[PDB]
Design a protein around this ligand. Structure first.
Ligand SMILES: *[C@@H]1O[C@H](CO)[C@@H](O)[C@H](O)[C@H]1NC(C)=O
Lengths: 132, 376, 281, 278, 98
């Protein structure tokens, strides 16, 4: 028999964790950018909630954008957030890619038949029709 | 239609090679294409019943053309008669033919459509409203139907679940199943994506269909082609030899065309001439593993004191990457898309239909507002 | 069902987590209109967010609930992703293989009972006719009634549906699958014929060229050519890899199964109506 | 989702809003005597891409319903978009980084900041040819030269060397008879310096033509194919390799993220512009 | 089919069939085969093979959800509970501050 496979948390490390760390950080910067102009002419927490609304997909809706420019900003950033989660649905899709190709050995085509591998021992029963 | 010698302009890989030699080599060149359609093969001379290979080669034996510059495969049957240079290319016979794949524009939604129930259950979502009214008893229709539509579509309109908590349980159930259905559909949408309907008949050497020819295997080659020697000598292929013979062509243009015209289901020829065409049109496909490998070489009358030098020269062409540069230089310019899956704006028309339905909708809308006006 | 051994209970357990979240939340909501209905909404509101959103629900305010909810939402999302993966796995599971018991099946043993009209048959003057007559005489008579003669008769009949299905030497039938145009014909289940035999050659009873003949034959068995002859003549198109299928009609009986669960829920709601109908004083 | 995004889907979405906007203002105004703004744009946005939009819902009967229909079909498209990307995920050509030495990356290791590595067996026709045509490659590769093909293989297999270069027949057989199937022939294994094995004779006096004849009789008989299957034939036949659940990589979405930032900047200066309008 | 830790290679080669054995001059040879043929045709042979062979089978049980994969989910569940406690005192301090 062949060996088994790892758990989902373990699976998450290959793709989910790095992206989560990088992107989560990215959301805060985006939230800060809209306010910049708004500030010029817990708000930060509200902005984070609005941006997080996309990720968890909780859509808490605690806060709304202050200005039309922000909405264009929201129009920009909101669409990007939607794309980011759709890419998370691509990550969702990636989880089902765990199926194992495995291995099979040909009677004549395979290398083992080609050479009794020193590391790979095979045999049959003595004084049998197979021996003959 | 009437064919007679004609002055023509010809340009080629072999020509560039020839002039490369001509600079490298002192000899000056004058070229005329052979009258014979095929390079030619040794054959019985009618009543005489014994004859030189003729065509390009016999002219060569005959001395009409001292040297033969062409993309000709190198084989022993010819080899005894004439000297051959080292072979420039190593092309192998494959079968150049294909069928456009069958894919579905209407297939994905269809999974519902044909299921029939997909629609019927939608109506039963509407019916659940009647059950809710029953729940209301002993503790709006438009809103209900709309609410039912929303669960299929996640409308989130406003009012929410019936006053009875128990009644509202079905909302969870129907939306549950609605969700499930959508997801299930998506999975079956992917089931479409799984595909694999197409069956490959390419392994010709190990193929079963090719070996036992029939009227469904209208198969040929070029009349008088080197593979015919293989069929000739291979008594094992006698069956196929004749099967093939009866359908043969004077040239590649007609042989490729038959498959393109779909006159003939399959075509058999070597790689150097065929693959470039495979790139050129590409609806057609090559299949299986090249068999009977050979390397191209120049054909010349025996004892040519230059063949050896030529061999050294083409050897150098390989050594200095010239041969290589030329092959990339022309072949490289032709490409075929790798197998991949793309949506291609097909299934989008149902949505086109939706937008057409929108128009119908808003037209109906004037009567819907008439209703408010009617209750005036 | 796999989620059910651990997953279904945890969902119930998930509701229990929700009560604790509400408890944190109730204090925040009222340091000391009728938001108290929110905990109920969360059981329902939280549940909606769990499955693909699609809940208007109610808007919870308590600060802790938003975090707690986002934690649950995350879970719900990966649940759905997990659910999609399971469905993704099913696409593999959705391989359609022929459902039949062959000779053993009642459709063959007691053909008359079924309302639908179907018939099995075999070639005339065959060795089996006798087996059939020595299995079921009546079945043999039925086969005799619907007699065909050439392979192509049967083939066409099968392709046209004139013939429901067809029994013959499996070896040949396998070869037929080896040569089908369009690959629409398969063997029974695995393909075990259920009659076991191999080809034989006649000799005058007195004659024994066979005992001498036998020796030559075995080595021939041992020799690679039998398999060459196999590959030469017996090679068959569309080798039977556990076959996989897809449906444009989806599944309406599986859908019905779903709808039966649905219907059960409807009954349950009627019961809750009854509880209110007969609500205790 | 590139083809759909490129055409019709966006224009159609504008029309539905616009139809609704006309109807909503007229109808809504019909409903209330005492409007389509950005909120309507968000609605095209809310219905169109997996919800998550909290700004508004139009107060009218005909358009809202029509859009719920749109949304449902749009969801199908969304689902298909996921499937479209799943199609990508179905298979991938994990052969993107390759050098054929006509690129000059091999020509210089030093151009690439990490040190690259490739080597071949010395006292070879390959090494002599290399020294003849390409000097720098020889002078650099002398450090990466290996004792024997099994040992050269040791430098490739256990790490500490990236690429190995050798005779094409041996490298092709080696690919087939590979302990680990990860090793693969370069490109199609289509080799430069196209050559073949040769048999020695003394000089112009020898077996000559009669001997060659025998050779091409072998091709006719077809023995070489059998001998190829027995001696030459290769494990893990070189089909295009398939990769499943490969670590996520982003480069085009990174571009998208940049698109976002740029679009923002535009709207910010748009606000400035607008302000100035005053 | 009885030991799920063992599996067969797919290819079947050297196709062959087992048989009863007697000396060439055995007077039971004619009788022994006729009996074998009768048992094949009768179904006796199927009863024996089916009776003995059918006892055991291996199937691809378990699917892929939860189970071992879900064990790390336990870790995830552990992670939700831990985060809330710090916020209590910290949140109270924040409230006191403003
Ligand atoms: C080539 O092989 C010879 C004989 O083993 C050896 O002396 C020489 O060092 C080799 N070439 C170099 C310089 O690697």
């Amino acid at each position: 028999k062949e060996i088994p496979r790892s758990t989902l948390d373990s699976f998450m490390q290959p793709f989910q964790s790095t992206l989560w760390l990088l992107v989560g950080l990215s959301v805060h910067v985006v939230a800060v950018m809209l306010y910049l102009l708004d500030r010029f002419s817990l708000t930060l927490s509200s902005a984070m909630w609005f941006s997080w609304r996309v990720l968890l997909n909780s859509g808490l809706g605690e806060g709304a954008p202050r200005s039309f420019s922000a909405r264009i900003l929201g129009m920009v950033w909101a669409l990007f957030a939607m794309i980011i989660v759709a890419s998370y649905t691509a990550n969702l899709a990636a989880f089902l890619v765990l199926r194992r190709p495995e291995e099979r050995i040909t009677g004549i085509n395979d290398p083992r038949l080609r050479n009794p591998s020193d590391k790979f021992i095979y045999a049959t029963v003595k004084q049998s029709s197979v021996d003959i | 239609p009437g064919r007679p010698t004609v002055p023509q302009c010809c340009y080629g890989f072999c020509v560039d090679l020839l002039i490369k030699l001509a600079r490298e080599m002192d000899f000056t060149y004058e070229v005329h294409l052979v009258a014979d359609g095929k390079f030619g093969t040794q054959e019985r001379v009618n009543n005489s019943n014994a004859a030189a290979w003729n065509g390009m080669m016999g002219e060569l034996l005959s001395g009409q053309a001292d040297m033969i510059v062409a993309p000709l495969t190198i084989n022993n049957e010819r080899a005894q008669y004439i000297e051959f240079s080292k072979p420039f290319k190593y092309q192998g016979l494959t079968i150049l033919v294909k069928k456009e794949i069958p894919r579905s524009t209407l297939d994905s939604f269809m999974q519902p459509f044909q299921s029939t129930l997909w629609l019927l259950v939608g109506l039963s979502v509407h019916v659940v409203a009647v059950m809710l009214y029953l729940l209301d008893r002993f503790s709006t229709l438009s809103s209900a139907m709309w609410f039912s539509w929303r669960v299929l579509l996640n409308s989130g309109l406003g009012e929410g679940a019936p006053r009875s908590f128990s009644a509202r349980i079905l909302g969870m159930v129907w939306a549950l199943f609605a969700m499930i259905i959508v997801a299930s559909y998506t999975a079956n949408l992917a089931a479409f994506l799984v595909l694999r309907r197409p069956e490959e008949r390419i392994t010709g050497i190990n193929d079963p269909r090719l070996r036992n020819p029939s009227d469904k295997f209208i198969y040929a080659t070029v009349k008088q082609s080197s593979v015919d020697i293989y069929f000739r000598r291979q008594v094992e292929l006698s069956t196929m030899y004749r099967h093939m013979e009866k359908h043969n062509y004077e040239s590649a243009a007609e042989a490729i065309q038959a498959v393109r015209d779909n006159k003939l289901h399959a075509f058999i020829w070597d790689s150097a001439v065929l693959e470039f065409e495979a790139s050129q049109d590409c609806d057609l496909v090559t299949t299986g593993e090249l068999f009977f490998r050979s390397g191209f070489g120049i054909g010349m009358r025996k004892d040519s004191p230059w063949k050896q030098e030529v061999s050294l020269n083409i050897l150098k062409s390989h050594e200095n990457g010239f041969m290589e540069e030329l092959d990339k230089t022309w072949v490289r310019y032709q490409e075929c898309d790798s197998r991949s899956n793309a949506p291609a704006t097909l299934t989008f028309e149902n949505m086109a239909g939706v937008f057409y339905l929108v128009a119908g909708g808003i037209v109906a809308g004037i009567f819907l507002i008439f209703i408010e006006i009617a209750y005036k | 069902e796999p989620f059910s051994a651990s997953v279904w209970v945890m969902m119930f357990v998930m509701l229990l987590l929700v009560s604790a979240m509400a408890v944190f939340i109730f204090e925040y909501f009222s340091p000391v209109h009728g938001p108290s209905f929110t905990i109920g909404k969360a059981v329902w509101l939280l549940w909606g967010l769990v499955f693909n959103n699609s809940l208007p629900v109610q808007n919870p305010k308590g600060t802790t609930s938003k975090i707690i909810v986002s934690i649950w939402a995350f879970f719900a999302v990966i649940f759905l992703a997990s659910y999609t993966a399971n469905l993704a796995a099913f696409m593999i599971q959705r391989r359609f293989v022929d459902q039949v018991t062959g000779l053993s099946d009642n459709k063959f043993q007691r053909p008359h009972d079924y309302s639908p009209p179907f018939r099995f048959g075999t070639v005339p003057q065959g060795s089996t006719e006798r087996n059939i007559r020595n299995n079921y005489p009546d079945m043999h008579q039925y086969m005799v009634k619907f007699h065909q003669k050439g392979v192509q008769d049967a083939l066409v009949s099968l392709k046209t549906g004139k013939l429901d299905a067809f029994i013959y030497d499996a070896a040949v039938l396998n070869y037929m699958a080896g040569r089908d145009e369009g690959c629409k014909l398969v063997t029974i289940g695995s393909g075990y014929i259920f009659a076991t035999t191999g080809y034989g050659i006649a000799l005058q009873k007195g004659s024994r060229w066979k005992r001498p003949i036998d020796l030559a034959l075995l080595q021939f068995v041992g020799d690679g050519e039998m398999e060459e002859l196999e590959k030469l003549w017996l090679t068959g198109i569309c080798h039977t890899e556990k076959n996989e299928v897809m449906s444009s009609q989806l599944d309406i009986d599986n859908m019905a199964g779903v709808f039966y669960m649905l219907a059960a829920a409807m009954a349950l709601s009627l019961i809750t109506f009854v509880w209110e109908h007969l609500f205790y004083k | 989702f590139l083809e759909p995004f490129s055409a019709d889907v966006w224009v159609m979405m504008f029309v539905m809003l616009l139809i609704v906007s006309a109807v909503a203002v007229f109808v809504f105004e019909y409903f209330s005597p005492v409007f389509t703004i950005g909120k309507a744009i968000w609605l095209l946005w809310g219905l169109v891409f997996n919800n998550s939009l909290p700004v508004q819902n139009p107060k009218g009967t005909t358009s809202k319903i029509m859009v719920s229909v749109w949304a449902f079909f749009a969801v199908i498209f969304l689902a298909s978009y996921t499937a479209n990307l799943a199609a990508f995920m179905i298979q991938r050509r994990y052969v993107d980084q390759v050098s054929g030495l006509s690129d000059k990356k091999f020509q210089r290791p030093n151009d690439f900041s990490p040190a690259f590595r490739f080597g071949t067996v010395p006292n070879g026709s390959t090494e002599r040819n290399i020294r003849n045509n390409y000097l720098e490659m020889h002078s650099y590769m002398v450090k990466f030269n290996q004792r024997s093909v099994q040992d050269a293989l040791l430098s490739l297999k256990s790490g500490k060397l990236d690429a190995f270069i050798y005779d094409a027949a041996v490298l092709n057989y080696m690919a087939g008879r590979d302990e680990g199937c990860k090793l693969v022939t370069i490109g199609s294994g289509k080799v430069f310096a196209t050559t073949g094995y040769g048999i020695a004779i003394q000089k112009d006096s020898g077996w000559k033509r009669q001997v060659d004849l025998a050779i091409l009789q072998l091709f006719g008989d077809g023995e070489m194919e059998e001998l190829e299957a027995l001696w030459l034939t290769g494990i893990c036949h070189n089909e295009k390799n398939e990769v499943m659940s490969s670590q996520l990589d982003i480069d085009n979405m990174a571009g998208v993220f940049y698109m976002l930032a740029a679009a923002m900047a535009l709207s910010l200066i748009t606000f400035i512009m607008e302000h100035l309008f005053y």
